[PDB]
Design a binder for this molecule. Sequence first.
Ligand code: ADP
Ligand code: BIT
Ligand code: VO4
Ligand code: MG
Length: 708
Amino acid sequence: NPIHDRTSDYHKYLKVKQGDSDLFKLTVSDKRYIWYNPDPKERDSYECGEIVSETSDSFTFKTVDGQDRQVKKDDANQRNPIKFDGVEDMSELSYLNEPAVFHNLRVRYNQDLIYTYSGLFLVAVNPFKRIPIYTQEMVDIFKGRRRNEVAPHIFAISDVAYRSMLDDRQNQSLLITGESGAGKTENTKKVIQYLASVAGRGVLEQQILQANPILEAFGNAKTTRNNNASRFGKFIEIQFNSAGFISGASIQSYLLEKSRVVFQSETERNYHIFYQLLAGATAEEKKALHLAGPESFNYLNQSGCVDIKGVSDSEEFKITRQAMDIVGFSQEEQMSIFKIIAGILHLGNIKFEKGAGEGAVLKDKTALNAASTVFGVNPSVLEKALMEPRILAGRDLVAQHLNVEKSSSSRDALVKALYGRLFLWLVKKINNVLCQERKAYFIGVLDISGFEIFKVNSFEQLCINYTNEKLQQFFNHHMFKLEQEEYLKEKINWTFIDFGLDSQATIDLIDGRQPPGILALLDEQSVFPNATDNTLITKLHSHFSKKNAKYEEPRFSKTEFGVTHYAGQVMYEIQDWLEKNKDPLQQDLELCFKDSSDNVVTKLFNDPNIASRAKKGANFITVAAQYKEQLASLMATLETTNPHFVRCIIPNNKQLPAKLEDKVVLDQLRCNGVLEGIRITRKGFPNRIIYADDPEQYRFGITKIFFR
Ligand SMILES: Nc1ncnc2c1ncn2[C@@H]1O[C@H](COP(=O)(O)OP(=O)(O)O)[C@@H](O)[C@H]1O
Ligand SMILES: Cc1ccc2c(c1)C(=O)[C@]1(O)CCN(c3ccccc3)C1=N2
Ligand code: VO4
Ligand SMILES: [Mg+2]
């Protein structure tokens, strides 16, 4: 039994190491200790001080340099007896305070124990290095074990949800939270791994796992926060039959950050797939697609970074191609996929310049021709569609002649639409393959793009961060609000506790209905024919400045507004919001591509599930309305499941192992509600059954007995 055998890999990598006689002496000491701030300005840097005396309301303790200070007992953060250091579930701590919780995660992390319970949910602190705890033999150990029978692990909460699904006949969800780079995506993959192994009886299982490298190659990119940042969110339904065997899966994908295809900030990359193609293509792929190196392509040569530390793009391309094979994409489908990737790189190299008059011309047609060739479209039709698109003016049909900037933006709009529709097509193709059985039950794993702050935050960052704020609201509603409403509806002598975490004011600012929040005002300005980015920001300032406590009109800029999110204030730059929200694409460009000789390109443009834009009145649904609809669908789905939460925690902002930064971590423990979440578990009454069915508590409700 590896659990009990101190020499096992399980003990070695998932259990706290045996302490020594030196540590035993320290563990039986009668001394008592306190966590204090050497520097009072610096509330998250703590040292340990010995308590040397006390009065009825105070402690005097020594400082590290030896001096002595005094603190009111009411303000004191006591250090737990050290026997608690490394404890597996923090609800067991005698003293529950910020530096003690952090210290416990510190002890575990220092020994590469990244998983720790904090009551009913799991905390996972990213190691930023590989740790051998996800092998088949680890899986085998966890299979079927109750949570208190085994060490903290993502496998354990996965097993717990899987047994609840069987035992209760109820759909489950695993909600993995965290800011960008914290570990959501990696933990999500472990959940799927685990569920596929323990509920497996095996092609379908391979196809479920091989979905991932395809989605990541096209949907992930290096940002300044994560070398493998998810730029789309997803909810993965793992499907089971009444017997509990896996019977299929379905991937709900959420809006992709398609602006990254045409622009990346300094040090960032475009989507991985562009680098994988250029590094891994054969000699004949490269010639047939007219490819060169990333440096030759405007969409890859602007950020100054074309490589990621520790990643071989040609190796990843082999893995993406093998995943495509396993999932079932044909050889011609694959070649079409790569033609669309190459063609986008060619479109980006088109250089418009100013003609005799205001209208643009194309004097060098090399990149236009190369694109047209791989796309299987007519280069004259394409050129005309870029620079002289036809529109209605009243009912008249009028050929425009766009200037360089407008031609360039239309070219960029076409590229983003090609790439976003290709992505949707990939997901649709994958799903039809995994759609093999009607499900009896599902466990849904949610992996959103995590909370993110850049030097410049745009409309995509606001939607990301709102998603994160809603997810945090959901944790709060499940841990605190619904928990206490149950106590109240049952009358068990409970005084309501204000846990002081309420995202509602920030949610209403962003998405409120009356008064209108930011998104409703954005939609308003989006169908107002005279609107500009500047009238938009003036309208936000007029509604919220010095009226809404979560909004700030900054004095240092006329083009930014601040939103105080649960995870910190973010300043958003309003430039391009109206164009991003309307997401226009000239119809003459669609007509050009509907005519493509390529079977995949033709689907992207003729298949209404892919090509069609929904309507509202006589305007295309805006991106904000599409955002809202996706989020409201997710929230509706989660409400039909029993949720389990895993809070991923980033150790620092440099993507380095062995470097836990106190301020970085504590900010997350605070805005995640981790200590509040531990307290509700300690102070409350987690279990309750309609009557039927030594010691003390225990509580009798109007229809249930509740026990702590
Ligand atoms: N359990 C883990 N084991 C090893 N590395 C991890 C783990 N979790 C995260 N990482 C590392 O951190 C990087 C960012 O994690 P990821 O899951 O992509 O973040 P996000 O929360 O943004 O999805 C990963 O590419 C991997 O290098
Ligand atoms: C439930 C839901 C709904 C919408 C979402 C997300 C999740 C995301 O995580 C993202 O997919 C991450 C990128 N993003 C996005 C991109 C461009 C414009 C708006 C949102 C997102 N929208
Ligand atoms: O860096 V992450 O996958 O939260 O977008
Ligand atoms: Mg991710």
